[PDB]
Amino acid sequence: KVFGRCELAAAMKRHGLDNYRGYSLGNWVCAAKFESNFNTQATNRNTDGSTDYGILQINSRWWCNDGRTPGSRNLCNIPCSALLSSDITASVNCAKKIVSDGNGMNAWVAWRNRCKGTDVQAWIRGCRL
Ligand SMILES: [Cl-]
Ligand SMILES: [Cl-]
Ligand SMILES: [Cl-]
Incomplete structure (x- = not known):
C-alpha cells in the first residue's frame, strides 16, 4: 500500500505514535516519507547482508526474522x-x-539526516486529525 500523507498521519495517531517517547506525529510521518516514500512494500538490502522492511525500514539484523x-x-x-x-x-x-x-529516533538514518531539527509539523499541516 502507498499511503497518502494525511492518511498515514491518521493511522499513526490511532496506533499511539503522537508524542510516543516525546516524538510528535510529524517526526514519524517525516521518517516514513524519507525511509519508504510511504510504501509498505519497500525493501532495501544492506552491505552487511541485512535487509530493511516496510514503511519504517526496520532492519533484519536486530528486529525481525527474514x-x-x-x-x-x-x-x-x-x-x-x-x-x-x-x-x-x-x-x-x-x-x-x-x-x-x-x-530514540536516531535509529532511523533518514530521520537523523532529513527530519531532525527541521519544521516537522509541516508533515501534518492541512490534515484532519
Ligand atoms: Cl493501518
Ligand atoms: Cl508534529
Ligand atoms: Cl529520545
Missing part, C-alpha cells in the same frame, strides 16, 4: 514479511520497541 540474516536477534518476534502489510500495526508495535532502545 531467514537469511545470520545471527538475527529478532527482538520484535515477527517475520520481516509482516512489516510489508497494508496494516501498519506490526511496523508501529516494532517501532515503539526500537525508539525505546536508548538512541
Whole structure:
C-alpha cells in the first residue's frame, strides 16, 4: 500500500505514535516519507547482508526474522514479511520497541539526516486529525 500523507498521519495517531517517547506525529510521518516514500512494500538490502522492511525500514539484523540474516536477534518476534502489510500495526508495535532502545529516533538514518531539527509539523499541516 502507498499511503497518502494525511492518511498515514491518521493511522499513526490511532496506533499511539503522537508524542510516543516525546516524538510528535510529524517526526514519524517525516521518517516514513524519507525511509519508504510511504510504501509498505519497500525493501532495501544492506552491505552487511541485512535487509530493511516496510514503511519504517526496520532492519533484519536486530528486529525481525527474514531467514537469511545470520545471527538475527529478532527482538520484535515477527517475520520481516509482516512489516510489508497494508496494516501498519506490526511496523508501529516494532517501532515503539526500537525508539525505546536508548538512541530514540536516531535509529532511523533518514530521520537523523532529513527530519531532525527541521519544521516537522509541516508533515501534518492541512490534515484532519
Ligand atoms: Cl508534529
Ligand atoms: Cl493501518
Ligand atoms: Cl529520545
